[PDB]
Design a protein around this ligand. Structure first.
Ligand code: A1D7Z
Ligand code: FE
Length: 463
């Protein structure tokens, strides 16, 4: 199954992922293995120091390179995209082999957590663990077996806007033990303590079963009806400037400083109702994936062009990984259910942070295609040439996957996004794209604070 911990090895037929272009070339695949190893060896998992912008910005190079290979990028496009995103990277941390070995003492493992200088140390520790006990046993030991170490790591994969679970999802999907170690290592060095508190306190509350279980889509809607949740945040988190230089920062963080400060008990009471049925996982997985497209693609405002929220779209891109968790024999139905629950509860926290935008699927559905005769194949190809850090192509590929996992359940009311709206949402995403989507690490094509009317002021009106 999983390629070597020591090397990246992709094949257009053996490792094409759950959703992809037609006719992936060996040439693109070799170029991809080249740039991935350059990225692993030369670039740190964070592209900023924490104090620079106030929160860590993440290295998306692994995710972008893989995604645009999967969508049929030529070797030249892979190189060009990778080279441009390489320019703002931090230099990789040093590996100390004595620390890698000492991390087998749980006291030492625990002492190294939350420290970015340990990123390649943890990568090697996880590569070693995979080779020692195999990946399936790593998932038990470091995620689902309910040890203090596995419960700690289960919260970390969601820290830093769920980049750990995104990385782990991609590793299982593309069958790379080397990317899986990267994933556990990314999670290990995060230190967003409020995720541990929210997910731990929410699981404890859910155990009491005080109110009935709802689909994620119903809980997105329930959050909006709540006075404390709908008012707990502000657009000000996306407009903060440093007093001295006027530079952008996230010194205040919507989740820590807004959602959990102002509406903690109210949100935990909603989160406690996302309880997933172990006997119904194919539908329950597809429903979480639909619900991510609902809250994200739904977050539109007439009379503006369709635009996608930078923070909400990590719900869609994180969501794909549960298709791999579902397909994994070594995980119990109960472990698979718990993973889904954690992901869903984070989706609610993220949604509240962005002002809980009321879905306007009517406005999304009437999106006028900039170009004629666009199907997924045409959208995928345009996503290859979109010059960001990979958010746009991951959003599009993950929505195309949700369309497929939803098709069997298109008649059920808890599936708010119906089959035709997925391609419309894909066209609306690529159509919102411009000729200069980024400047270094700054994004311009995504909205920030879609739930706040003022966020939409710099977005053109639909013609
Ligand atoms: C560009 C960019 C990358 C990131 O990973 C995160 C987390 C933020 C807030 C950003 O603005
Ligand atoms: Fe991201």
């Amino acid at each position: 199954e999983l390629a070597s911990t020591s090397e990246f090895r992709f094949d257009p037929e053996r490792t094409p992922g759950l959703r992809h272009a037609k006719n992936l070339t060996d040439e693109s695949t070799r170029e991809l293995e080249r740039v991935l190893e350059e990225n692993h060896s030369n670039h740190h998992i964070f592209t900023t120091t924490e104090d620079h912008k106030g929160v860590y910005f993440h290295n998306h190079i692994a995710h972008h390179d893989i995604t645009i290979w999967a969508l049929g990028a030529n070797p030249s496009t892979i190189r060009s995209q990778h080279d441009r995103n390489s320019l703002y990277q931090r230099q990789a941390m040093v590996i100390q082999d004595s620390v890698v070995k000492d991390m087998a003492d749980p006291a030492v493992y625990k002492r190294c957590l939350g420290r970015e200088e340990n990123f390649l140390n943890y990568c090697r520790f996880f590569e070693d663990e995979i080779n020692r006990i195999g990946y399936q046993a790593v998932l038990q030991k470091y995620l689902v077996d309910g040890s203090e170490i596995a419960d700690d790591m289960l919260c970390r994969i969601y820290m830093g806007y769920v980049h750990g679970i995104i990385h782990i999802g991609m590793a299982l999907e593309f069958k790379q033990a080397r990317l899986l170690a990267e994933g556990f290592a990314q999670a290990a060095v995060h230190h967003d303590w409020w995720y541990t508190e929210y997910l731990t306190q929410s699981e404890e509350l859910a155990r009491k079963q005080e109110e009935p279980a709802l689909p994620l889509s119903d809980l997105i809607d329930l959050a909006r009806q709540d006075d404390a949740i709908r008012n707990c945040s502000t657009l000000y988190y996306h407009l903060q400037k440093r007093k001295v230089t006027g530079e952008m920062c996230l010194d205040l963080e919507p989740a820590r400083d807004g959602v959990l400060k102002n509406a903690g008990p109210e949100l935990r009471r909603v989160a406690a109702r996302y309880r997933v049925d172990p006997n119904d996982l194919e539908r329950a997985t597809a429903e979480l994936q639909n619900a991510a497209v609902y809250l994200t693609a739904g977050a539109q405002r007439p009379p503006h062009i369709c635009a996608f929220d930078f923070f909400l779209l990590h719900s869609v891109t994180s969501s794909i990984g549960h298709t791999m968790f579902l397909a994994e024999p070594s995980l119990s139905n109960a472990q698979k259910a718990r993973l889904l629950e954690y992901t869903g509860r984070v989706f609610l926290l993220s949604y509240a942070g962005q002002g809980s935008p009321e879905p306007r699927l009517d406005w999304l559905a009437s999106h006028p295609s900039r170009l004629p005769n666009q199907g997924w194949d045409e959208v995928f190809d345009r996503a290859c040439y979109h010059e960001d850090d990979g958010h746009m192509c991951k959003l599009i590929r993950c929505m195309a996957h949700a369309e497929e996992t939803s098709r069997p359940y298109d008649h059920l009311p808890e599936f708010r996004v119906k089959q035709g709206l997925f391609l419309t949402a894909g066209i609306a995403a690529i159509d919102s794209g411009t000729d200069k989507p980024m400047d270094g690490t700054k994004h311009f094509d995504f909205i920030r604070g879609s739930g706040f009317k003022e966020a939409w002021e710099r977005f053109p009106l639909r013609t």
